[PDB]
Amino acid sequence: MDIDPYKEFGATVELLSFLPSDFFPSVRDLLDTASALYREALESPEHCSPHHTALRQAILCWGELMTLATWVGVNLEDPASRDLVVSYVNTNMGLKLRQLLWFHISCLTFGRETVIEYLVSFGVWIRTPPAYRPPNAPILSTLPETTVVRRR
Amino acid sequence: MDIDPYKEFGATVELLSFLPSDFFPSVRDLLDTASALYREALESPEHCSPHHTALRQAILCWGELMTLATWVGVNLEDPASRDLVVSYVNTNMGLKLRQLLWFHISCLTFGRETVIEYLVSFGVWIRTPPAYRPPNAPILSTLPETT
Amino acid sequence: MDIDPYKEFGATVELLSFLPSDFFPSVRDLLDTASALYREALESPEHCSPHHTALRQAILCWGELMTLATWVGVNLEDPASRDLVVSYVNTNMGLKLRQLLWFHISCLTFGRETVIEYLVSFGVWIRTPPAYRPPNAPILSTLPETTVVRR
Amino acid sequence: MDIDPYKEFGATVELLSFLPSDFFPSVRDLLDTASALYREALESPEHCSPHHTALRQAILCWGELMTLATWVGVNLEDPASRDLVVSYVNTNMGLKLRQLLWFHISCLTFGRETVIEYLVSFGVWIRTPPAYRPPNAPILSTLPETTVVRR
């Protein structure tokens, strides 16, 4: 039974596989973003959308790894293996979560069709050799390109 | 932020704590149950319901922990350290997952309102003193038993 | 009781903690802006807007902490104990004031719905990797863009 | 910046200066009256009235001085200084605040127009020399000091 976490949502793991690891915010930046934006919907006793249902499971998935990370510190006396496993939880298992947090926080912010269409145009850009492509990657942002929020 | 896992489904951590920790079927007995009944819906490119969405996440949460335990076997040359890590994952981290699989596999099979009532009714049984407690714990059943 | 100063205005304490602590201008820059713009309305018998009511209380709250810090200098001799309380008022308690002045002076100026989407947009901007975000930091302005003869 | 807290509510600082300093109940008694009657509206996600907006700011002003009162105790190593500045925060800074808490808690019950004409009437009473002054001062109440009811 091979489950594709994004296939339910119209994306694919191959489609998100082109985004470099530098693309994603840190796992703390994404938890702050979900907390400061969606937490009233995430803590509510409702299903708002499937992106909410999926973030709730992902945020708890990470909290149980952060229990493991703080566990191997107190309950493991070998210092060489304490920091070797914590490196794996933060760098490896964190990279797969950052990808998953980024996807649902973006589909709530920008809409799901916009994020999927952005991952196509970003893949076109990232597959182009650096000489033949524009130097700036495509941007996904709520800000105007000039920023300068103004009013209305 | 708190995010009680069960709250959007009508339960709470305090309501699933009526069940003892050793009540739950081993993770592999749960994965083979979902694989038997639900595999085609769990792998479909659709939103079937929120319980499907929450199983898909839980099953992937587990597969990434078994990757962790496969990694701890290869990459840790201390056998005295590797046991406490691999055992903590299969036991301590399995329990909180083993509760969450049991909940959604049972709400897909038996319905969600039946599983909430099962938790209340199992709490009445587990709270009864051992003298007056019936010998047979409550159990979820699909049988009207038609003839 | 637990009261959130921002909650009646559509914001929370974490939504203003979602921006860096050094984003907010100094207390004196914010008190100058209130007088250079909103003085007459803050001195009036009218209620005007709830941002005025909330901002009057904040300006007066800070006037009492400056009476305190002036009091401590005169009436508290021990210098190491004075530097702890004077710096605590100006920094730790000043940070919570800076956020509260900044929020109401900006909602009176730019609108409340604008400042709330600015806090969300500026905080997501700063957590994005630099290559993947617009190069310029967001900013609030009332000056219309390229209005005459450019558009 | 010369802001008057009460001017938007129809009073002044010298209209509340009719009431002696020791008239006002302790901050604890005033925070229990706001917590008893008004707590659900003070924590509400809405603007109930200007008196709510003013209490919300004032209850938060006191919460920050009780963090200062706690921080001084822990973070100052001189017992001569720590006990001197905490006395200022409780006594000196609490007087102006419990005068402010009294006014808004007294306006939410009884109404605002009643609390103003209570201040005028209590001044007429407190200015009267003690020989000609009646024994029973004015009082804010919704019911007589004796109320006959059948049940």
Write out the two tokens for B76. 């840790």
Residues of B in contact with A42 (CB under 8 A): 1, 3
What is the three-class DSSP state of D4? coil
**Which residue type does D64 have?**
E
| B56: number of Cβ within 10 Å | 26
Domain count, chain C: 1
| Length of chain A measured in residues | 152
Write out the two tokens for C136. 């310029």
Query: Which residues, in sequence order, are CB contacts of B63 under 8 Å at separation 6+?
Result: none
How big is chain B by its Cα radius of gyration, in Å? 18
Structural determination approach: cryo-EM
Q: How many CA atoms lie within 13 A of C137 on its CB side?
A: 8
Q: Which of D109, D47, D46 is nearest to C47 (CA)?
A: D47
Q: Round to whole Å and give the CA distance between A120 and A114.
A: 10
Chains in touch with A (3+ beta-carbon pairs under 8 Å) read B, C
- Our answer on whether A and D touch (3+ beta-carbon pairs < 8 Å) is no
Q: Round to whole Å and give the CA distance between C106 and C109.
A: 5
Give CA angle at C70 (C66, C71), nearest 5°. Answer: 115
First vs last Cα of chain A: how many Å apart? 49
Cα B89 to chain centroid distance, Å, stands at 15
Contact C11, C103 (CB under 8 A): yes
Q: Round to whole Å and give the CA distance between D55 and D59.
A: 6
DSSP A39-84: HHHHSSSS---HHHHHHHHHHHHHHHHHHHHHHHHHS---HHHHHH
| Length of chain B measured in residues | 147
Q: Which of D60, D55, D57 is nearest to D105 (CA)?
A: D55
**Which residue type does A72 have?**
V
Q: What is the 3-state secondary structure (H, E, C) of B48-110?
A: CCHHHHHHHHHHHHHHHHHHHHHHHHHHCCCHHHHHHHHHHHHHHHHHHHHHHHHHHHHHHHH
> Domain of A94: which CATH number?
1.10.4090.10
| D119: number of Cβ within 10 Å | 20
Cα C40 to chain centroid distance, Å, stands at 19
Q: Round to whole Å and give the CA distance between B123 and B119.
A: 6
**Which residue type does B123 have?**
G
Q: Round to whole Å and give the CA distance between D146 and D151.
A: 15
First vs last Cα of chain D: how many Å apart? 55
Give CA angle at C113 (A59, D61), nearest 5°. Answer: 80
H/E stretch holding D89 reads none
Flag if C18 and A25 touch (Cβ within 8 Å): no
**Which residue type does B75 have?**
N
Residues of A in contact with C118 (CB under 8 A): 149
D67-90 burial code (b ≥16 CB/10 A, e <16): ebbeebeeebeeeebbebbbebbe
Give CA angle at D138 (D133, D144), nearest 5°. Answer: 125
Measure CB to CB from residue A36 to each of C14, C131, C139 and give the nearest one: C14
Which single residue is written with the structure tokens 């006396």? Answer: A77
Query: Which residues, in sequence order, are CB contacts of C51 under 8 Å at separation 6+?
Result: C9, C104, C107, C108, C112
Q: For chain C, say whether D57 makes contact (Cβ under 8 Å).
A: yes
Write out the two tokens for A4. 């594709």
Q: Round to whole Å and give the CA distance between C120 and A37.
A: 7
Write out the two tokens for A105. 């926080």
Contact C19, C106 (CB under 8 A): no
Q: Which long-range contacts (CB under 8 A, 24 or more apart) does A140-144 make?
A: A140/A106, A140/A110, A140/A114, A140/A115, A140/C132, A141/C125, A141/C128, A141/C133, A141/C134, A142/A109, A142/A110, A142/C117, A142/C120, A142/C121, A142/C124, A143/C121, A143/C125, A143/C134, A143/C138
Resolution (Å) of this entry: 2.8
Query: Residue B113 to residues A97, B106, D94: CA-CA distances in angstroms?
Result: 32, 10, 55
Which single residue is written with the structure tokens 């009944």? Answer: B37
C17: containing domain: 1-151
Residues of A in contact with C12 (CB under 8 A): 36
| A134: number of Cβ within 10 Å | 8
Expressed in percent and rounded to 5, the helix, strand and coil fractions of chain A are 65, 0, 35
Q: Round to whole Å and give the CA distance between C103 and C101.
A: 5
Contact B58, B97 (CB under 8 A): yes
Contact C109, C142 (CB under 8 A): yes
Query: Which residues, in sequence order, are CB contacts of C151 under 8 Å at separation 6+?
Result: C145
Which single residue is written with the structure tokens 């999926």? Answer: A54
Which single residue is written with the structure tokens 């100094």? Answer: C26
Q: For chain C, say whether A21 makes contact (Cβ under 8 Å).
A: no
Contact D16, D87 (CB under 8 A): no
Cα C88 to chain centroid distance, Å, stands at 18
Give CA angle at A125 (A120, A128), nearest 5°. Answer: 125
Q: Round to whole Å and give the CA distance between A139 and A141.
A: 6
Among chain A residues, CA nearest to C138:
A147
Q: Which of A24, A52, A58 is nearest to A39 (CA)?
A: A52
| D109: number of Cβ within 10 Å | 14
Give CA angle at A141 (A135, A144), nearest 5°. Answer: 95
Q: Round to whole Å and give the CA distance between C92 and B71.
A: 46
Q: Round to whole Å and give the CA distance between B49 and B57.
A: 13
Among chain A residues, CA nearest to C12:
A36
Q: Round to whole Å and give the CA distance between A36 and C124.
A: 10
Q: Which of C16, C85, C54 is nearest to D58 (CA)?
A: C54
Flag if A78 and B75 touch (Cβ within 8 Å): no
Q: Round to whole Å and give the CA distance between B19 and B119.
A: 7
Q: Which of C79, C129, B81, C47 is nearest to D6 (CA)?
A: C47
Q: Which long-range contacts (CB under 8 A, 24 or more apart) does D105-113 make?
A: D105/D30, D105/D33, D105/D34, D105/D37, D105/D38, D105/D55, D106/D140, D107/D9, D107/D51, D108/D37, D108/D38, D108/D49, D108/D51, D108/D52, D108/D55, D109/D37, D109/D140, D109/D142, D110/D140, D110/D142, D112/D9, D112/D10, D112/D51, D113/D10
Torsion angle in degrees (nearest 10) through CA of B38, B44, B48, B49: 70
Torsion angle in degrees (nearest 10) through CA of C128, C134, C135, C136: -100
CA of B135, closest CA in chain A: separation in Å?
Answer: 36
Which single residue is written with the structure tokens 């199983």? Answer: B55
Q: Round to whole Å and give the CA distance between B104 and B110.
A: 10
Query: Which residues, in sequence order, are CB contacts of B24 under 8 Å at separation 6+?
Result: B30, B95, B98, B99, B102
Which single residue is written with the structure tokens 């003070």? Answer: D42
Write out the two tokens for A89. 């939880």
Cα A94 to chain centroid distance, Å, stands at 9
Write out the two tokens for B82. 């590797």
- For D49: left if phi > 0, alpha if psi spans -120 to 50, otherwise beta; the answer is beta
Query: Which residues, in sequence order, are CB contacts of B76 under 8 Å at separation 6+?
Result: A81, A84, A85, B82, B85
Contact C81, C60 (CB under 8 A): no
Q: Round to whole Å and give the CA distance between A112 and A98.
A: 17
